Coordinates of C-alpha atoms and ligand atoms in Angstrom, one line a residue:
Chain A
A1 CA -3.7 -5.5 14.3
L2 CA -3.1 -7.6 11.2
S3 CA -0.4 -9.6 13.0
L4 CA -2.7 -10.9 15.5
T5 CA -3.8 -14.6 15.3
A6 CA -7.4 -15.6 15.7
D7 CA -6.7 -16.7 19.4
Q8 CA -4.9 -13.4 20.0
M9 CA -7.7 -11.5 18.5
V10 CA -10.3 -13.3 20.7
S11 CA -8.3 -12.9 24.0
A12 CA -7.7 -9.3 23.2
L13 CA -11.4 -8.6 22.7
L14 CA -12.3 -10.6 25.7
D15 CA -10.0 -8.7 28.0
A16 CA -11.2 -5.3 26.5
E17 CA -14.9 -6.0 27.6
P18 CA -16.6 -3.1 29.4
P19 CA -17.7 -3.7 33.1
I20 CA -21.5 -4.4 33.9
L21 CA -22.7 -1.0 35.3
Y22 CA -25.5 -0.6 37.8
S23 CA -28.6 1.6 37.6
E24 CA -29.1 4.3 40.1
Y25 CA -29.9 2.9 43.5
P26 CA -43.1 1.8 40.6
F27 CA -41.5 3.7 37.7
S28 CA -43.1 6.5 35.7
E29 CA -42.4 7.4 32.1
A30 CA -40.1 10.2 33.1
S31 CA -38.4 8.2 36.1
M32 CA -37.8 5.2 33.7
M33 CA -36.3 7.4 31.0
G34 CA -34.0 9.1 33.6
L35 CA -32.6 5.9 34.8
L36 CA -32.0 4.6 31.3
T37 CA -30.5 7.9 30.1
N38 CA -28.2 7.9 33.2
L39 CA -27.2 4.3 32.6
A40 CA -26.4 4.8 29.0
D41 CA -24.3 7.9 29.7
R42 CA -22.1 6.1 32.1
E43 CA -21.8 3.2 29.7
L44 CA -20.7 5.5 26.8
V45 CA -17.5 6.2 28.8
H46 CA -16.4 2.5 29.0
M47 CA -17.6 1.9 25.5
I48 CA -14.8 4.4 24.4
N49 CA -12.2 2.8 26.5
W50 CA -13.4 -0.6 24.8
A51 CA -13.3 0.9 21.4
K52 CA -9.7 2.2 21.8
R53 CA -8.7 -1.4 22.6
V54 CA -10.5 -2.8 19.4
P55 CA -7.7 -3.9 17.1
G56 CA -7.2 -1.2 14.3
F57 CA -9.4 1.4 15.9
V58 CA -6.7 3.7 17.3
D59 CA -4.8 3.3 14.1
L60 CA -7.6 5.6 12.6
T61 CA -7.6 9.5 12.8
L62 CA -9.6 11.0 15.6
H63 CA -12.1 12.2 12.8
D64 CA -12.9 8.7 11.8
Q65 CA -13.0 7.3 15.6
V66 CA -15.6 10.0 16.3
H67 CA -17.6 9.2 13.3
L68 CA -17.7 5.4 14.0
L69 CA -18.7 5.8 17.6
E70 CA -21.5 8.3 16.6
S71 CA -23.1 6.0 14.2
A72 CA -22.8 2.7 16.3
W73 CA -23.1 3.7 19.9
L74 CA -26.7 2.7 20.2
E75 CA -26.2 -0.5 18.3
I76 CA -23.3 -1.4 20.7
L77 CA -25.5 -0.7 23.8
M78 CA -28.3 -2.8 22.2
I79 CA -26.2 -5.9 21.5
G80 CA -24.7 -5.6 24.8
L81 CA -28.2 -5.4 26.3
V82 CA -29.5 -8.5 24.4
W83 CA -26.3 -10.4 25.3
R84 CA -26.6 -10.2 29.1
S85 CA -30.4 -10.6 28.8
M86 CA -29.9 -14.1 27.2
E87 CA -30.3 -15.9 30.5
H88 CA -33.5 -14.1 31.2
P89 CA -36.4 -15.2 28.9
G90 CA -38.9 -12.5 28.4
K91 CA -36.7 -9.9 30.3
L92 CA -34.0 -7.3 29.4
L93 CA -31.2 -6.9 31.8
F94 CA -30.3 -3.1 31.5
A95 CA -28.6 -3.6 34.8
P96 CA -28.3 -6.4 37.6
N97 CA -30.6 -4.0 39.6
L98 CA -32.8 -3.1 36.5
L99 CA -34.6 -6.2 35.1
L100 CA -37.6 -5.1 33.1
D101 CA -40.5 -7.0 31.5
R102 CA -43.1 -5.9 28.7
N103 CA -45.4 -4.3 31.1
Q104 CA -42.4 -2.3 32.5
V105 CA -43.0 4.3 28.6
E106 CA -45.0 5.1 25.5
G107 CA -43.6 4.3 22.2
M108 CA -41.0 2.0 23.4
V109 CA -42.9 -1.4 23.5
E110 CA -42.2 -2.0 19.9
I111 CA -38.4 -1.7 20.3
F112 CA -38.5 -3.5 23.6
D113 CA -40.1 -6.6 21.9
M114 CA -37.5 -6.3 19.0
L115 CA -34.7 -6.6 21.6
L116 CA -36.4 -9.5 23.4
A117 CA -36.7 -11.3 20.0
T118 CA -33.0 -10.7 19.3
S119 CA -32.2 -12.1 22.8
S120 CA -34.4 -15.2 22.1
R121 CA -32.4 -15.6 18.8
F122 CA -29.1 -15.5 20.4
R123 CA -30.3 -18.1 23.0
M124 CA -31.6 -20.4 20.3
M125 CA -28.3 -20.1 18.4
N126 CA -26.5 -20.4 21.8
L127 CA -24.3 -17.4 21.1
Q128 CA -20.9 -17.7 22.6
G129 CA -19.0 -14.9 24.3
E130 CA -16.2 -15.2 21.9
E131 CA -18.7 -14.8 19.0
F132 CA -20.3 -11.9 20.9
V133 CA -17.1 -9.7 21.2
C134 CA -16.4 -10.3 17.4
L135 CA -19.9 -9.1 16.4
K136 CA -19.6 -6.1 18.6
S137 CA -16.3 -5.1 16.9
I138 CA -17.8 -5.5 13.5
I139 CA -20.7 -3.3 14.5
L140 CA -18.2 -0.6 15.5
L141 CA -16.1 -0.8 12.4
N142 CA -18.9 -1.3 9.9
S143 CA -21.8 1.0 10.9
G144 CA -20.0 4.2 9.7
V145 CA -17.7 3.3 6.7
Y146 CA -20.0 4.9 4.0
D147 CA -9.0 -0.4 2.7
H148 CA -7.5 -0.6 6.3
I149 CA -11.0 -1.1 8.0
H150 CA -12.2 -3.7 5.5
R151 CA -8.9 -5.7 6.1
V152 CA -9.6 -5.5 9.9
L153 CA -13.2 -6.5 9.2
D154 CA -11.9 -9.6 7.2
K155 CA -9.7 -10.4 10.0
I156 CA -12.6 -10.6 12.4
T157 CA -14.4 -12.6 9.9
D158 CA -11.5 -15.0 9.8
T159 CA -11.7 -15.1 13.7
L160 CA -15.3 -15.9 13.7
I161 CA -14.8 -18.8 11.3
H162 CA -11.9 -19.9 13.4
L163 CA -14.1 -20.1 16.5
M164 CA -16.7 -22.2 14.6
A165 CA -14.1 -24.4 13.0
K166 CA -12.5 -25.1 16.4
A167 CA -15.9 -25.8 17.8
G168 CA -16.2 -28.7 15.3
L169 CA -18.7 -27.3 12.8
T170 CA -18.3 -28.5 9.2
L171 CA -17.3 -25.8 6.6
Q172 CA -20.9 -25.6 5.3
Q173 CA -22.1 -25.1 8.9
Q174 CA -19.4 -22.5 9.4
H175 CA -20.6 -20.5 6.5
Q176 CA -24.2 -20.8 7.4
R177 CA -23.7 -19.8 11.1
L178 CA -21.5 -16.9 10.0
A179 CA -24.3 -15.8 7.6
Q180 CA -26.9 -16.2 10.5
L181 CA -25.0 -13.9 12.8
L182 CA -24.3 -11.1 10.3
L183 CA -27.8 -11.0 9.2
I184 CA -28.8 -10.4 12.9
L185 CA -26.7 -7.2 12.6
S186 CA -29.0 -5.9 10.1
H187 CA -31.9 -6.2 12.7
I188 CA -29.7 -4.5 15.3
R189 CA -29.2 -1.7 12.9
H190 CA -32.9 -1.5 12.4
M191 CA -33.6 -1.4 16.3
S192 CA -31.0 1.5 16.4
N193 CA -32.6 3.4 13.8
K194 CA -36.0 3.1 15.5
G195 CA -34.4 3.9 18.8
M196 CA -32.5 7.0 17.5
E197 CA -35.8 8.0 16.0
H198 CA -37.8 7.6 19.2
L199 CA -35.2 8.9 21.7
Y200 CA -34.8 12.0 19.6
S201 CA -38.5 12.2 19.1
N202 CA -28.9 14.5 27.2
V203 CA -26.3 11.9 26.2
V204 CA -24.8 12.6 22.7
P205 CA -21.3 14.0 23.5
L206 CA -19.4 11.3 22.0
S207 CA -17.4 13.9 20.2
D208 CA -17.0 15.7 23.3
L209 CA -16.5 12.5 25.4
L210 CA -13.7 11.0 23.2
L211 CA -11.8 14.2 22.9
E212 CA -11.6 14.7 26.8
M213 CA -10.4 11.1 27.1
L214 CA -7.2 12.1 25.3
Chain B
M1 CA -39.6 -28.5 -2.2
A2 CA -36.9 -25.7 -2.6
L3 CA -34.8 -27.5 0.1
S4 CA -33.9 -30.0 -2.5
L5 CA -32.7 -27.5 -5.2
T6 CA -29.0 -27.4 -6.0
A7 CA -27.1 -24.3 -6.1
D8 CA -27.2 -23.9 -9.9
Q9 CA -31.0 -24.6 -9.8
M10 CA -31.5 -21.9 -7.2
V11 CA -29.4 -19.6 -9.4
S12 CA -31.4 -20.4 -12.5
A13 CA -34.7 -20.0 -10.7
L14 CA -33.8 -16.6 -9.5
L15 CA -32.2 -15.2 -12.7
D16 CA -35.3 -16.2 -14.5
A17 CA -37.6 -14.7 -11.9
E18 CA -35.9 -11.3 -12.3
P19 CA -38.3 -8.3 -12.8
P20 CA -38.2 -6.2 -15.9
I21 CA -36.5 -2.9 -16.1
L22 CA -39.3 -0.3 -16.3
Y23 CA -39.3 3.2 -17.8
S24 CA -40.3 6.6 -16.6
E25 CA -43.1 8.4 -18.5
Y26 CA -42.1 10.2 -21.7
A27 CA -40.7 19.4 -8.1
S28 CA -42.4 16.7 -10.0
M29 CA -39.5 14.4 -9.6
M30 CA -41.2 12.8 -6.6
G31 CA -44.2 12.2 -8.8
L32 CA -42.3 10.3 -11.3
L33 CA -40.5 8.2 -8.9
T34 CA -43.8 7.4 -7.0
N35 CA -45.3 6.3 -10.2
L36 CA -42.3 4.2 -11.0
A37 CA -42.2 2.6 -7.7
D38 CA -45.9 1.8 -7.9
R39 CA -45.4 0.0 -11.2
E40 CA -42.3 -1.9 -10.0
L41 CA -44.2 -3.1 -6.9
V42 CA -46.4 -5.2 -9.1
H43 CA -43.4 -7.1 -10.7
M44 CA -41.8 -7.5 -7.3
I45 CA -44.8 -9.5 -6.1
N46 CA -44.4 -11.8 -9.1
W47 CA -40.7 -12.1 -8.4
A48 CA -41.3 -12.8 -4.7
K49 CA -43.7 -15.6 -5.6
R50 CA -41.0 -17.1 -7.6
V51 CA -38.5 -17.0 -4.8
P52 CA -37.8 -20.7 -3.8
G53 CA -39.7 -21.3 -0.5
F54 CA -41.6 -18.3 -0.5
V55 CA -45.0 -19.8 -1.5
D56 CA -44.6 -22.4 1.1
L57 CA -45.2 -19.6 3.7
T58 CA -48.3 -18.4 5.2
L59 CA -49.9 -15.6 3.0
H60 CA -50.0 -13.3 6.1
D61 CA -46.3 -14.1 6.5
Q62 CA -45.8 -13.4 2.8
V63 CA -47.3 -10.0 3.3
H64 CA -45.4 -9.1 6.3
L65 CA -42.1 -10.0 4.7
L66 CA -43.0 -7.9 1.6
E67 CA -44.1 -4.8 3.6
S68 CA -40.8 -5.0 5.6
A69 CA -38.5 -5.4 2.7
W70 CA -40.2 -3.6 -0.3
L71 CA -38.0 -0.4 -0.1
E72 CA -34.9 -2.4 0.6
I73 CA -35.7 -4.5 -2.5
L74 CA -36.4 -1.3 -4.6
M75 CA -33.1 0.3 -3.3
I76 CA -30.9 -2.8 -3.9
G77 CA -32.4 -3.0 -7.4
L78 CA -31.5 0.7 -8.0
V79 CA -28.0 0.3 -6.7
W80 CA -27.7 -2.6 -9.0
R81 CA -28.7 -0.7 -12.1
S82 CA -26.6 2.3 -11.2
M83 CA -23.6 0.2 -10.7
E84 CA -22.1 1.1 -14.2
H85 CA -23.0 4.8 -13.9
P86 CA -20.6 6.4 -11.3
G87 CA -22.2 9.4 -9.6
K88 CA -25.6 8.8 -11.0
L89 CA -28.7 6.7 -10.0
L90 CA -30.5 4.9 -12.7
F91 CA -34.1 4.8 -11.5
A92 CA -35.1 4.3 -15.1
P93 CA -33.2 4.1 -18.3
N94 CA -34.9 7.5 -19.1
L95 CA -34.5 8.7 -15.6
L96 CA -30.7 8.9 -14.8
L97 CA -30.3 11.5 -12.0
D98 CA -27.1 13.1 -10.8
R99 CA -26.1 13.9 -7.2
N100 CA -27.2 17.4 -7.3
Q101 CA -30.5 16.6 -8.9
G102 CA -31.2 14.9 -5.5
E103 CA -35.0 18.5 0.3
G104 CA -33.0 16.2 2.6
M105 CA -32.8 13.3 0.2
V106 CA -29.3 14.3 -0.7
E107 CA -28.3 12.3 2.2
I108 CA -30.3 9.1 1.0
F109 CA -29.0 9.8 -2.5
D110 CA -25.4 9.9 -1.2
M111 CA -25.8 6.6 0.7
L112 CA -27.1 5.0 -2.5
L113 CA -24.3 6.1 -4.5
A114 CA -21.9 4.9 -1.8
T115 CA -23.5 1.5 -1.9
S116 CA -23.3 1.5 -5.8
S117 CA -19.5 2.3 -5.5
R118 CA -18.8 -0.6 -3.1
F119 CA -20.7 -3.2 -5.3
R120 CA -18.6 -1.8 -8.2
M121 CA -15.5 -2.1 -6.2
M122 CA -16.5 -5.6 -5.1
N123 CA -17.4 -6.4 -8.6
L124 CA -20.7 -7.7 -7.7
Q125 CA -22.0 -10.5 -10.0
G126 CA -25.5 -10.9 -11.2
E127 CA -25.9 -14.2 -9.6
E128 CA -24.7 -12.8 -6.4
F129 CA -27.2 -9.9 -6.6
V130 CA -30.3 -12.0 -7.0
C131 CA -29.2 -14.0 -3.9
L132 CA -28.8 -10.9 -1.9
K133 CA -32.1 -9.6 -2.9
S134 CA -33.7 -13.0 -1.9
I135 CA -32.1 -12.7 1.6
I136 CA -33.5 -9.3 2.1
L137 CA -37.0 -10.6 1.3
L138 CA -36.8 -13.4 3.7
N139 CA -34.8 -11.7 6.5
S140 CA -36.1 -8.1 6.8
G141 CA -39.2 -9.1 8.7
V142 CA -38.4 -12.4 10.3
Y143 CA -38.0 -10.7 13.7
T144 CA -41.2 -8.8 13.8
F145 CA -43.9 -11.5 13.2
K146 CA -41.1 -20.3 10.9
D147 CA -38.0 -22.4 10.8
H148 CA -38.6 -22.9 7.2
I149 CA -37.4 -19.5 6.4
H150 CA -34.0 -20.0 8.1
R151 CA -33.7 -23.3 6.2
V152 CA -34.2 -21.5 3.0
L153 CA -31.9 -18.7 4.0
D154 CA -29.3 -21.4 4.9
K155 CA -29.4 -22.7 1.2
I156 CA -29.1 -19.2 -0.3
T157 CA -25.9 -19.0 1.8
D158 CA -24.9 -22.3 0.4
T159 CA -25.7 -21.0 -3.2
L160 CA -23.6 -17.8 -2.6
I161 CA -20.6 -19.8 -1.3
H162 CA -20.8 -22.1 -4.4
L163 CA -20.8 -19.2 -6.8
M164 CA -17.7 -18.0 -5.0
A165 CA -16.0 -21.3 -5.1
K166 CA -17.0 -21.6 -8.8
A167 CA -15.3 -18.2 -9.5
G168 CA -12.1 -19.7 -8.1
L169 CA -12.0 -17.8 -4.8
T170 CA -10.0 -19.5 -2.0
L171 CA -12.0 -20.9 1.0
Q172 CA -10.8 -18.0 3.1
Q173 CA -11.8 -15.5 0.3
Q174 CA -15.2 -17.1 0.3
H175 CA -16.2 -16.5 3.7
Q176 CA -14.6 -13.0 3.6
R177 CA -16.6 -12.0 0.5
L178 CA -19.7 -13.6 2.1
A179 CA -19.2 -11.5 5.1
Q180 CA -18.7 -8.3 3.1
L181 CA -21.9 -8.8 1.1
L182 CA -24.0 -9.3 4.1
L183 CA -22.6 -6.4 6.0
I184 CA -23.8 -4.2 3.1
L185 CA -27.4 -5.5 3.8
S186 CA -27.1 -3.7 7.2
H187 CA -26.5 -0.3 5.3
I188 CA -29.3 -1.1 2.9
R189 CA -31.6 -1.5 6.0
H190 CA -30.3 1.7 7.2
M191 CA -31.1 3.5 3.9
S192 CA -34.6 2.0 3.9
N193 CA -35.3 3.2 7.4
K194 CA -34.0 6.7 6.6
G195 CA -35.9 6.5 3.4
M196 CA -39.1 5.3 5.0
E197 CA -39.1 8.1 7.5
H198 CA -38.5 10.7 4.7
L199 CA -41.5 9.3 2.8
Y200 CA -43.2 9.7 6.2
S201 CA -41.8 13.2 6.4
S202 CA -49.4 -1.4 2.2
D203 CA -52.4 -3.5 2.9
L204 CA -52.8 -3.7 -0.9
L205 CA -50.0 -6.3 -0.7
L206 CA -52.6 -9.0 0.2
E207 CA -54.6 -8.0 -2.9
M208 CA -51.7 -8.6 -5.2
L209 CA -51.1 -11.9 -3.5
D210 CA -54.7 -13.0 -3.2
Ligands
C6V301 C1 -36.2 -0.5 24.7 C2 -35.1 0.2 25.2 F1 -35.2 0.8 26.4 F2 -34.0 -0.6 25.2 C3 -34.8 1.5 24.2 C4 -35.6 1.8 23.4 C5 -35.4 3.0 22.2 F3 -36.3 3.4 21.5 C6 -34.3 3.6 22.3 C7 -33.3 3.2 23.3 C8 -33.4 2.3 24.3 C9 -32.2 2.1 25.2 S1 -31.5 0.4 24.8 C10 -30.0 0.7 25.8 C11 -29.4 -0.4 26.3 C12 -28.5 -0.2 27.6 O1 -27.2 -0.9 27.6 C13 -28.7 1.2 28.4 C14 -29.7 2.0 28.1 C15 -30.7 1.6 27.1 C16 -31.3 2.7 26.4 O2 -32.0 3.6 27.2 C17 -31.6 4.8 26.7 C18 -30.5 5.0 26.0 C19 -30.0 6.2 25.5 C20 -30.8 7.3 25.9 C21 -30.3 8.7 25.4 C22 -31.3 9.9 25.5 C23 -30.6 11.2 25.6 O3 -29.5 11.3 25.1 O4 -31.3 12.2 25.9 C24 -31.9 7.2 26.7 C25 -32.3 6.1 27.2
C6V302 C1 -35.1 9.0 -4.7 C2 -34.3 8.4 -3.5 F1 -33.8 7.1 -4.1 F2 -33.3 9.1 -3.2 C3 -35.2 7.8 -2.4 C4 -35.0 8.5 -1.2 C5 -35.8 8.1 0.2 F3 -35.5 8.8 1.4 C6 -36.8 7.2 0.0 C7 -37.1 6.5 -1.4 C8 -36.3 6.8 -2.4 C9 -36.7 6.1 -3.8 S1 -35.4 4.5 -4.0 C10 -36.5 3.8 -5.1 C11 -35.7 3.1 -6.2 C12 -36.5 2.7 -7.4 O1 -36.4 1.4 -8.0 C13 -37.9 3.5 -7.6 C14 -38.1 4.7 -7.0 C15 -37.1 5.1 -6.0 C16 -37.8 5.7 -4.8 O2 -38.5 6.8 -5.4 C17 -39.8 6.8 -4.5 C18 -40.0 5.5 -4.0 C19 -41.1 5.2 -3.4 C20 -42.1 6.2 -3.1 C21 -43.3 5.9 -2.3 C22 -44.3 7.1 -2.2 C23 -45.7 6.8 -1.8 O3 -45.9 5.6 -1.3 O4 -46.6 7.6 -1.8 C24 -41.9 7.5 -3.6 C25 -40.7 7.8 -4.3

């Protein structure tokens, strides 16, 4: 974990990427929720396989692994959502067969627009895939900490910087972009909080799930 | 305007803009905190107006940023004051509450303690603190409304790095510490949302700015 170079870290994260799942082959509030709920359920399974391939995660106790996934699972789904929705302005790509707009469930339009704004921010910054997988790993490891983990987090920070330095950015630009990316995570946390609020205002067996994976 | 300020000039402006540490009046624990928060809000507006680049913004934008960040700013201030008091939160010098003094807020309290311990373990400096508080003000509501904000945010980033470089930290330790600090802002946002929904369980901002 702490032995990996920045390049080894990147390739390991890239190859550990979860597959793009499909929705079940007009919508109502109930039907829309059912599709999204089912999609998220099947995605959680792959998220666990991905998490167990994130450097330093399996080094943790099963107790800590459950706690980190329980806190970050919606954040991870959301950043995954806004990432694949980058090439679709004004639209969210939940699934290749499920591309929705603003007009496409009461109480969700606020978080929907927040996800759209985040996607536009990534597109404006021209977020790269190598940067995306680093941000996703950070979310997993940081969302539920409150010195092994912090050292792994520092390693991912070095990896991000390495990617920016290799891209030709000046050290000032490296620090600025790093700051810009990590501040977005605060907004992703915000969207998750509102999401966890609204959703639980069917798919929560991460403790159950992770244990049956063993 | 503020885009011409140096790192040291940015620090000096923020340090001198710092709000005073208010006192509590010499169950009803909520009443005291509500009153304290009310009086702190007035000074927060004065502080915000002195944050470099904040007055260059639309007033409606100034209001939006303040309403989105006001609890985050109150909390990071609390965490800052409580740094030298392990296991306690210093809402006021005469209002120092323990963990068990903290229905349901014991969760919010523990998160505030944990944040206080981290800043203590990181040995957060005052110059770093005022920068973090400035970031919170400018970043918390930027995705719920122009490019001026991001420019100002970029120079606060420049300021933070400068402070770390002056402290003697290596260039690797600089971006690592920068990352650690900003990741804590995510948890502060989390505490605010959890706090905001408990206060649940703001158009007067324009008046104070008018
Ligand atoms: C706006 C919105 F739809 F994204 C959205 C707005 C919110 F307030 C909250 C969540 C969302 C999301 S984002 C996520 C991204 C994707 O990769 C896949 C699914 C969707 C998921 O839909 C979901 C997600 C989880 C559940 C769980 C319910 C249960 O356990 O009973 C139900 C529907
Ligand atoms: C008490 C606590 F910190 F745990 C806590 C847990 C939460 F879930 C949410 C907020 C808090 C806090 S943090 C803040 C830090 C300080 O500088 C000053 C006061 C306190 C404030 O007490 C408050 C703050 C605001 C209000 C608003 C009431 C209204 O508008 O009517 C009421 C009480």
